[PDB]
């Protein structure tokens with residue numbers, strides 16, 4: 001079973017593509033080494049196709065079936081509801097890819113008769129037809145990165161028509177939003193805010209007599225997902241207490257879309273056929289998480305890991321267990337990897353045991369420690385700032401659908417780099433354009449949110465605590481990583497950011513209201529004589545319930 005079969009037709013762009021970093025009057029204030037930043041384009045799609053195309057083989061043992069039985073038992077306690085057409089329409093991002101049937105996302109959100117009538121016809125077809133493959137479009141993603149030691153090819157996105165996507169929501173939004181946590185419990189990563197993820201990892205690490213942990217990187221996970229895997233996923237969904245109509249729709253979507261289907265480029269030409277995970281469907285996140293959890297849990301048993309605790313976020317996996325010594329741990333990991341491989345999940349980078357929690361990277365992030373105003377140790381989530389800064393550079397010269405700088409500030413507010421650079425840089429820009437009150441779209445765990453920059457102090461306090469505005473004395477390793485990134489990209493030093501931050505702060509304070517609050521809390525680090533920094537009122541008015549519940553990457557979800 002080949003993950004993909006190709007016809008030879010190219011994966012084409014739907015518009016002009018820029019690979020080199022766009023430069024404007026503000027670029028140099030952020031970084032000088034422009035040539036280090038690039039965006040992937042359809043021109044490298046061929047390289048990616050070669051990487052993701054291969055045969056899959058699976059050998060399923062009793063551990064695999066035992067874990068699946070446990071998962072099904074838990075799934076049977078779930079009761080999910082079908083979404084109405086309007087509810088599903090409201091979850092559609094305003095700028096989602098238009099339908100080829102005469103209507104767009106805007107029409108969907110407005111509940112226009114034409115869009116609504118077509119959605120109903122698609123739904124009706126799903127109930128009556130459970131065998132005809134559904135068409136999908138394949139595109140090369142345009143993403144920004146920084147040249148790495150060891151340029152990456154564009155990732156591929158595969159998605160069905162807008163009408164089908166709305167139907168996916170009606171049949172599965174509730175399921176993908178609630179089933180994972182019930183089945184995986186504390187191992188389900190998307191139920192945690194950054195701070196809660198740290199808490200879980202730290203408490204788990206402390207729960208072992210001699211902790212040992214490792215991250216497991218499956219090589220091209222989506223391509224390793226087999227027909228068996230996708231049918232097993234469906235069998236789990238079907239354990240739920242569902243309306244018969246939902247069961248039919250889920251069965252149909254699985255047979256006609258999730259298992260595989262024809263691939264069409266932006267020009268309308270047949271590019272080939274997919275027999276693996278589609279990266280752009282509602283169940284991509286839930287499905288990968290379930291499958292990764294199933295295989296990893298079985299592998300932990302096959303390798304005889306002692307008290308293994310897992311944390312899974314889609315294809316991202318981390319395991320923390322009881323150490324049996326350096327030599328034995330190395331042996332256990334090899335067996336774990338052999339098991340994963342038998343399950344069709346071979347590693348890209350071979351896993352290695354770590355005995356220092358800070359050195360374990362999962363979800364492209366790691367736990368580190370700093371100190372608050374009181375001098376107390378505070379654990380927080382951070383990550384290598386390279387990609388975040390590369391994308392900020394792009395966003396500095398071009399307006400984009402997703403403002404990664406905002407999402408990164410939200411998720412990494414306590415970090416040295418987000419505070420010193422991202423906050424300072426963008427608030428200066430917002431001030432100059434008098435766009436402080438303009439809400440911006442960003443993404444959290446794949447879902448899109450419209451957020452007002454002025455609400456950041458409230459958001460940060462609620463999610464990270466007041467200490468996020470006073471962290472200092474960062475770790476040697478974190479300091480070295482940030483310093484390295486600044487040199488690599490050619491970013492101005494601390495003295496320059498502090499100077500700018502003092503100016504931005506002074507300007508915000510003069511604005512009063514929420515702006516003044518942003519200046520007081522976000523930039524207290526820049527002043528020589530720090531201020532009070534006490535709780536904030538309004539903060540408790542924003543509804544943050546739903547932000548960290550489930551993953552929706554590739555799911556075309558809008559939460560507002």
Ligand SMILES: Cc1ccc(S(=O)(=O)Nc2cc(-c3ccc(F)cc3)sc2C(=O)O)cc1
Pocket residue numbers: 415416419420471472473474475479480482483486493494525
């Ligand atoms: C957000 C923030 C908080 C504190 C400071 S600081 O200058 O007081 N002290 C500190 C500055 C650091 C630093 C390290 C590497 C760089 F490439 C730039 C700055 S690390 C640190 C520390 O306290 O451990 C700056 C920025």
